[PDB]
Amino acid sequence: RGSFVEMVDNLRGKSGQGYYVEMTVGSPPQTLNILVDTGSSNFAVGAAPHPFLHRYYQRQLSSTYRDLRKGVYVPYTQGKWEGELGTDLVSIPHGPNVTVRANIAAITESDKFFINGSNWEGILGLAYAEIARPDDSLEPFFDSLVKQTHVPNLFSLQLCGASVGGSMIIGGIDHSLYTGSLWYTPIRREWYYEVIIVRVEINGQDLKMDCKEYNYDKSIVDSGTTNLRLPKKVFEAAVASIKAASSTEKFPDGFWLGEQLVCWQAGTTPWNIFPVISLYLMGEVTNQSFRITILPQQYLRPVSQDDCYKFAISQSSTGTVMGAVIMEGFYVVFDRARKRIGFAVSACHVHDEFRTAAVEGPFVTLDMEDCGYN
Ligand SMILES: NC1=N[C@](c2ccc(OC(F)F)cc2)([C@@H]2C[C@H]2C(=O)c2cncc(Cl)c2)CO1
Ligand code: NA
Numbered sequence: 001r002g003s004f005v006e007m008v009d010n011l012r013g014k015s016g017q018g019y020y021v022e023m024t025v026g027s028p029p030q031t032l033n034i035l036v037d038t039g040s041s042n043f044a045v046g047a048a049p050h051p052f053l054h055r056y057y058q059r060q061l062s063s064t065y066r067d068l069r070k071g072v073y074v075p076y077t078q079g080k081w082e083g084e085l086g087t088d089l090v091s092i093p094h095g096p097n098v099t100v101r102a103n104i105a106a107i108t109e110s111d112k113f114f115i116n117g118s119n120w121e122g123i124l125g126l127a128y129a130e131i132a133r134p135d136d137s138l139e140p141f142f143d144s145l146v147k148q149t150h151v152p153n154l155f156s157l158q159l160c161g162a163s164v165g166g167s168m169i170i171g172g173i174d175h176s177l178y179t180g181s182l183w184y185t186p187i188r189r190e191w192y193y194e195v196i197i198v199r200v201e202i203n204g205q206d207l208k209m210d211c212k213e214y215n216y217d218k219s220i221v222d223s224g225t226t227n228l229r230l231p232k233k234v235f236e237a238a239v240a241s242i243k244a245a246s247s248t249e250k251f252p253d254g255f256w257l258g259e260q261l262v263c264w265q266a267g268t269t270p271w272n273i274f275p276v277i278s279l280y281l282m283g284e285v286t287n288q289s290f291r292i293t294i295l296p297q298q299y300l301r302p303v304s305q306d307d308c309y310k311f312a313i314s315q316s317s318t319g320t321v322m323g324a325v326i327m328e329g330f331y332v333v334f335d336r337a338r339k340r341i342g343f344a345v346s347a348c349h350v351h352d353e354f355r356t357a358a359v360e361g362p363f364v365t366l367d368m369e370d371c372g373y374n
């Protein structure tokens with residue numbers, strides 16, 4: 001409890017391409033880099049020589065592979081992966097010193113899934129069985145890990161933005177990774193890591209929307225999404241307020257829609273024209289909330305001889321997505337045992353001399369249960 005030095009710095013990443021952890025599959029162990037994804041629930045790995053892949057799972061080389069004689073087809077947008085299900089022995093070299101027999105989807109065909117030039121070859125879906133493919137009887141990796149070992153039923157993530165890195169602490173918390181106190185919001189339902197946002201402020205100014213809008217049709221914490229994604233109506237209200245706060249300088253209308261970048265010469269980014277963004281989350285106690293605050297350092301993503309940034313807040317039709325834009329400000333504790341998610345100021349988040357990311361409570365917020373969409 002509290003200190004896991006061997007897992008510190010076990011994540012690496014390229015900006016906008018997610019964070020991955022080294023894993024091994026099969027016997028003898030085959031090493032793969034695997035995207036850490038709290039927004040899905042399948043352990044799926046490249047298993048054929050796709051040109052983009054540095055490497056892939058060669059089941060024929062594993063004496064411990066067991067075929068489940070079942071295929072899985074997984075469309076989404078944009079894209080798809082298809083694979084064959086089995087089990088095999090899985091370890092995390094810079095994780096707990098255990099080995100688990102986990103479900104693995106061997107990806108044999110995909111479209112717009114693997115990224116050309118990325119250093120990961122599969123994804124580790126850390127969410128719950130209710131969104132596993134093909135169905136909730138395919139036990140997710142972390143469920144198997146907890147069933148078969150004594151690893152406590154929780155993990156935590158410190159994503160450090162900018163080559164990026166960070167830490168996945170499996171089975172506990174490392175208090176070096178955060179400053180101040182952890183604040184917890186309930187996991188509303190175990191499918192995604194679903195939470196309830198109860199108030200949104202831009203530079204301290206309330207958007208004053210019916211809070212059910214903030215969670216239309218859900219709000220999730222998702223390490224496998226780059227952006228803060230906001231439901232359309234909330235996004236419209238949000239940019240408008242951000243546009244207004246930031247009007248000392250003017251930017252193309254397309255910038256706010258992510259359709260073009262904006263640049264400034266090096267050292268010349270005007271952070272302070274941009275507002276902070278505060279999400280109040282449902283607390284642990286009736287009528288009690290807390291708030292997490294992020295900087296433009298978080299929602300202006302670095303991507304000419306200038307520092308060009310992408311606006312990393314974007315509209316959504318799947319509800320709010322707290323992606324790397326949120327998570328890079330905080331140490332985030334996925335406290336599965338207590339069905340709650342803790343947030344604390346991250347010891348590694350990017351800021352400036354004037355503003356820091358923040359986690360503050362308690363606040364008095366009534367009718368928070370009304371904020372959840374049904
Ligand atoms: N959270 C989420 N993960 C995704 C995903 C795609 C299929 C699934 O199938 C699953 F059921 F196996 C699951 C998740 C993508 C893997 C992520 C991805 O491609 C990505 C690209 N750039 C940056 C990041 Cl941070 C991630 C879609 O959104
Ligand atoms: Na256990």
Ligand code: NA
Nearest residue numbers: 175176178179
């Ligand atoms: Na600390």
